[PDB]
Ligand binder design. Sequence first.
Ligand SMILES: *[C@@H]1O[C@H](CO)[C@@H](O)[C@H](O)[C@H]1NC(C)=O
Ligand SMILES: *[C@@H]1O[C@H](CO)[C@@H](O)[C@H](O)[C@H]1NC(C)=O
Lengths: 240, 186, 186, 171
Amino acid sequence: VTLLEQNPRWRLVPRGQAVNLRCILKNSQYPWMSWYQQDLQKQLQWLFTLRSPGDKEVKSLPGADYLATRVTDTELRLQVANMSQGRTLYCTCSPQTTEVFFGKGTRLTVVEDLNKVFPPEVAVFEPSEAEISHTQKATLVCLATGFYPDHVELSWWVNGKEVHSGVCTDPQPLKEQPALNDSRYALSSRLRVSATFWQNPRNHFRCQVQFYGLSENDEWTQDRAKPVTQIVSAEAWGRA
Amino acid sequence: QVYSLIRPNENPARHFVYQFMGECYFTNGTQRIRYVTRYIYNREEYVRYDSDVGEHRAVTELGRPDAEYWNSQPEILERTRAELDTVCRHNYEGPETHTSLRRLEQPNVVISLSRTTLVCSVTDFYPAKIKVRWFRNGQEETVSSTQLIRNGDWTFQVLVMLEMTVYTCHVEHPSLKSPITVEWTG
Amino acid sequence: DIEADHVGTYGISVYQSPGDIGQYTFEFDGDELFYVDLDKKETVWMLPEFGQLASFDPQGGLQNIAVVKHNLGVLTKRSNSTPATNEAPQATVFPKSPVLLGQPNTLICFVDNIFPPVINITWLRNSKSVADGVYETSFFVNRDYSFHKLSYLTFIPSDDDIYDCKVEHWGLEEPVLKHWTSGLEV
Amino acid sequence: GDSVTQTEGPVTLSEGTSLTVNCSYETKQYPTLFWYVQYPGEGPQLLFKVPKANEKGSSRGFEATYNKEATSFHLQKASVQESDSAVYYCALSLNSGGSNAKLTFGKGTKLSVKSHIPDPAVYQLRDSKSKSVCLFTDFDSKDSDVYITDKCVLKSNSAVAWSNKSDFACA
Ligand SMILES: *[C@@H]1O[C@H](CO)[C@@H](O)[C@H](O)[C@H]1NC(C)=O
Ligand SMILES: *[C@@H]1O[C@H](CO)[C@@H](O)[C@H](O)[C@H]1NC(C)=O
């Protein structure tokens, strides 16, 4: 199972701001906790290794100033200040016999202007009648377009329960402006069910997309709605 | 070049002193290496690993849980066993070849005499392996010498006393191409 | 005892509580290779020439103390907090080189049977304190798990001066004073 | 232990072929060699480790030899699979030096496995908008305002393409 717990998963960081990260250890046989950095080019680099409570280490590499702290026997902190380049920070645990276990990670996205944040638009599409009569299978397609940053995660819901059978999501989003680095992203997903399942109107299909955007602590003076952390979804009933 | 260290194992889950030490014993260079770790709590060794045994052993009753736990974990027992190669053998064949095994300090010999007789003082040399001899014309056993004095700054000194009342103090040391002879006056 | 040609103590961790006092050293044939300054997190070689040839990552020694600090807390909660009594140290003053008046020399104070490893060693020239030109080594471990330490004082051997090595320890009702003059033997 | 050199990716293989990711380490102290795999939506997880030199570790179909002679740790698999399309990292850690839990990673090697594999199928679907979404199940674009997603593995493959211009057809 999970020997660690790192929160949060995503973070929108203005340029020059500070970020405080947590990590909780769940196994005593892995007391050597560490921080690892993975840059935008997917290069892993070791930062600190703290063992006893009260340890305090400092590392200053280009793009971010670090400050790790071992508060208690299971509490590991990390402060990232003066951030000008986005990166991902993984909390790890290991015994003295080196066996490093990485957590889920925290993706830090640095933005210079907050006017580029956009929430995704979700739309489900009912499967074609040609597939139902040819393969006896119905494939629903969900689509989330025009969001920045890519701090989203999609999940399907059938009658209030999250399903996974026949559910595929794109591992990486698409860039709507491929020539731009601050390009808005798009993400799709699929759900395959039997033809008899889709032909049952009693079944409720839902595509939930959790978007992590802005908080109420951020000043916003624009003519459009604030791109705050919200849940955009779309429903579709069964058709026979 | 680069020194390797022995890592002590961890315990699972009013003045006090705790000591840990990892010892590497060398005989024919690296042909005979003995590796021993010691866990000391208040002048009482309670857990010891010995390469001649191959596993941790409880020196006192206080160390029975720690020795059983460390030996029950294969990844822990194998890491301790491998330290004979990753620490003992590495340090001797590596950094110590450039530092300790190369340091040579030539001795200084003075031959002043005083009795209550005719002592020879050999000071500031390294290593401690040294041979001192007395010979007016032929060497005489007779005569007592002090123990090897360790100055603590990587030098040694020794004092040999000639019980008997052209004398020469003969000294042979690995730092000398030829033995040092001094013309004693008495 | 163990018979060998060389003994490499590649890791000596000593920790005391309360006070959060630690020490990490490397030894070879009884002499100190270096010590890791736990406050500055840097390796300090006794022989500066050895630091120019070899090297050692001090973070390994720092994490070595983190283990013994952890094990000591677990052992304190196991032995029902059983502390070790204090010992009375013994000092000995002797010169490093044969004493020649006018020629610079170093005076050595050898304090043995030190436990716990906390001590206050100071020199006196004619009953007056001297703090400049004084070097002090780390706590060397003994086979009975007590400690010994050496202090050094550079001086000009004159026929008049009288030197004292003052030793203050918890196991001493009164401070120990060892004397030395230019016309003594030892 | 300074560097770990790895095979410059990306590696494109057909399902059923053999993988060979080279790795050569350079260190001054005895290391323990590792192989880590990171999937496109997950964090790096340990594949297997080799603590003892001149031995081999195995995980799934992957093997690597702690070759102390040539200082290599080449990753090899007999029959690759699409599900193994990820980035692989060669890593080491000093057994008796420096900090604990300190790994030295290479640059990483990306692996893309295309299926070997007929009966393609393109469908059109729509709901409550009147854009258009098309589904491509092809075993094996230049137009503007047309977005085509990468083919999902899910074995059944499927790629999603959509466009918001009026005169757009699956075609
Ligand atoms: C082992 O030591 C002996 C002397 O004790 C020496 O003659 C020999 O060369 C050494 N090395 C061997 C036997 O490989
Ligand atoms: C011993 O006492 C303190 C150390 O706590 C120090 O200031 C002093 O110089 C030492 N020596 C004495 C008092 O002779």
